[PDB]
Design a protein around this ligand. Structure first.
Ligand code: ZN
Ligand code: ZN
Ligand code: ZN
Lengths: 115, 67, 260, 46, 124
């Protein structure tokens, strides 16, 4: 009667942007990234990778409503740095980490099956 | 009415274990040892096999609508 | 400011589960990997049923739901098939779906067990796991003499976010800091608690001395497979899926940055 | 057009037209059931 | 199919509607990846004093781990909480039915060890 289709958690609606960047006016060098059709899976890793950047002053995320299917990630960096650049580098670092983890898991599987 | 396919909690397949479970029980296994023989180690899957009531066997006592 | 250099150590690899350890990674990465095991590792499962005849004691939706939860071997085919969203065909085609047929009739006096062995596929690679060449076959329905079940299913590509039938795991044990050194738990009576299987403590010692400078490292995993994928295929596909989620996010990020 | 029904007691496929008392021709039983339609109903296995 | 707003009840007067449904990766999990089918609020216990709910949960954990059916007949001196706890401690569990759970969203351990186990629920 009121059950949303299960794909609405993963699929973007037509004309709906995957990610939107909005300047935070309260403090300088801060941005809000509203990412649609993602959840804690990417939010937590992006936040925790951003916390590894010493040029990042704030890194947090929230799912504003569990029934809704977006996350907001707030990133504040030092003045010489940018929150968009920080977010990009965090994603790049996560991708490199996962590539290395995948190659090493392939090697470990090969060793385990062989000996 | 019939053995579920998956465990509600983890999603382990239990549908193929009801008949084997009954065969082990008539083989004078205890329910715990029978559940151990089938590889149900989490108490959720043990719940699935141990609390199942095979009502379909009673629904098959009625003749169908068509011969 | 840069990536981790995680290492891996697989401590057990069977056809049923894979038990491994990831070290030198963040807890968020470990838990996102754990979540992707459950919710973003695609597999093949029946997601369309057409009942041509069902004289059994279970109504049509019961049979359909029950067929959807039968695991189908998805190892090499899931990467090749497309989502029906992405397929440029009609409702179905062999590029985005797999056809199953089931046609059973109880003529004999003993009860006929319609099992997953009766799910006949057009694709030899995508078959019910129990039907793969021990464990018995999953029971779809019991039929009495004169009862009959004839249906035509189509299996699709999906993951556990959409429905648990596309979840490839039969349990994902995840653990870290087996000895409570980070004190992320606070036992009122630490002596009362059993020791983890990964604990390295003498029996007199209940929990490790508190580590003020500690961070969660060394996450232990036991990924049990429902049957569709091999456990190591579940882990590899999870890592690839998480990496493609991040790559797509970065692509859209670049478009948003350059459009500003 | 035929509207063949099944007998509740003898399970016999028999045709009955409108304005006809509901009686099985094989055993006279008074309760009849319609047969499953031929239309194509689809189920998402969910 | 059960949904938000459907009423469920245990056998102890503990009724309530489904507030929300989380997927298995969003629910909290034990070290062996068991997620609860249902999560009920601890504040429903103290004023109500439905200790039978807790004893049934603990007995049910013992029953599921032992492969039996628990005897909850009302006035039975051969079955008390200490015996059930001693039985549960033999299956590698905290004797009082608590377990370390992990946050499904972040994977971090929950500081307070949660009371979890099989309980018979009813859909109304
Ligand atoms: Zn289970
Ligand atoms: Zn197609
Ligand atoms: Zn008749």
């Amino acid at each position: 009667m009121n059950a949303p289709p299960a794909f609405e958690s993963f699929l973007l609606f037509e004309g709906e942007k995957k990610i939107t960047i909005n300047k935070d006016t309260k403090v300088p060098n801060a941005c809000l990234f509203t990412i649609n059709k993602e959840d804690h899976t990417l939010g937590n890793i992006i936040k925790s990778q951003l916390l590894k950047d010493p040029q990042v002053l704030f890194a947090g995320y929230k799912v504003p409503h569990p029934l809704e299917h977006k996350i907001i990630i707030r990133v504040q960096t030092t003045p010489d740095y940018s929150p968009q650049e920080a977010f990009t580098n965090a994603i790049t670092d996560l991708i490199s980490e996962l590539s290395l983890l995948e190659e090493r898991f392939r090697v470990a599987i090969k060793d385990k099956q062989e000996g | 009415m019939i053995i579920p396919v998956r465990c509600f909690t983890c999603g382990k397949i239990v549908g193929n274990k009801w008949e084997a479970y009954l065969g082990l029980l008539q083989a004078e296994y205890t329910e715990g040892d029978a559940l151990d023989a089938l590889g149900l180690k989490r108490y959720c899957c043990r719940r699935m096999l141990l609390a199942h009531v095979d009502l379909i066997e009673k629904l098959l006592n009625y003749a169908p609508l068509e011969k | 400011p840069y990536a981790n250099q995680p290492t891996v150590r697989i401590t057990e690899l069977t056809d049923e589960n894979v038990k491994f350890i990831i070290e030198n990674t963040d807890l968020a990465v470990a838990n996102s990997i754990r979540r992707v095991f459950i919710a973003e590792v695609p597999i093949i499962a029946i997601d369309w049923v057409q009942i041509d005849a069902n004289s059994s004691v279970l109504h049509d939706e019961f049979i359909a739901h029950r067929l959807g939860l039968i695991p189908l071997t998805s190892d090499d085919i899931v990467d090749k098939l497309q989502y029906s969203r992405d397929c440029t065909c009609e409702e179905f085609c062999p590029e985005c779906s797999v056809e199953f047929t089931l046609d059973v009739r109880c003529n004999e006096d003993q009860t006929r067990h319609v099992t997953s062995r009766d799910l006949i596929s057009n694709s030899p690679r995508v078959i019910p796991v129990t039907s793969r060449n021990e464990q018995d076959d999953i029971l779809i329905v019991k039929l009495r003499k004169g009862q009959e079940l004839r249906l035509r299913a189509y299996a699709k590509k999906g993951f556990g976010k959409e429905h648990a039938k596309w979840n490839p795991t039969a349990g994902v044990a995840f653990e870290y800091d087996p000895d409570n050194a980070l004190r992320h738990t606070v036992y009122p009576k630490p002596e009362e608690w059993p020791k983890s299987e990964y604990s390295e403590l003498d029996e007199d010692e209940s929990q490790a001395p508190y580590d003020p400078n500690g961070k969660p490292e060394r996450f232990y995993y036991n990924v049990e497979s429902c049957g569709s994928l091999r456990p190591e295929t579940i882990v590899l596909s999870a890592l690839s899926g998480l990496k493609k989620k991040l790559s797509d996010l970065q692509t859209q990020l670049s478009h948003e940055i350059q459009s500003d | 057009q035929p509207m063949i029904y099944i007998c509740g007691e003898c399970h016999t496929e028999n045709e009955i037209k409108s304005r006809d008392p509901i009686r099985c021709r094989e055993c006279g039983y008074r309760i009849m059931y319609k047969k499953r339609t031929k239309r194509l109903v689809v189920f998402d296995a969910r | 199919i059960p949904q938000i707003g459907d009423k469920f009840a245990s056998r102890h007067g503990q009724k309530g509607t489904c507030g929300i449904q989380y997927r298995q990766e969003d629910m909290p999990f034990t070290c062996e990846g068991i997620t609860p089918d249902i999560i009920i609020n601890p504040h429903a216990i103290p004023s109500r004093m439905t200790i039978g709910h807790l004893i049934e949960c603990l007995q049910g954990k013992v029953s599921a781990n032992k492969g039996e059916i628990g005897d909850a007949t009302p006035f039975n001196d051969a079955v008390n909480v200490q015996k059930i706890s001693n039985l549960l401690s033999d299956y590698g569990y905290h004797l009082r039915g608590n377990e370390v759970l992990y946050n499904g969203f972040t994977g971090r351990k929950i500081t307070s060890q949660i009371f979890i186990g099989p309980t018979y629920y009813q859909r109304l």
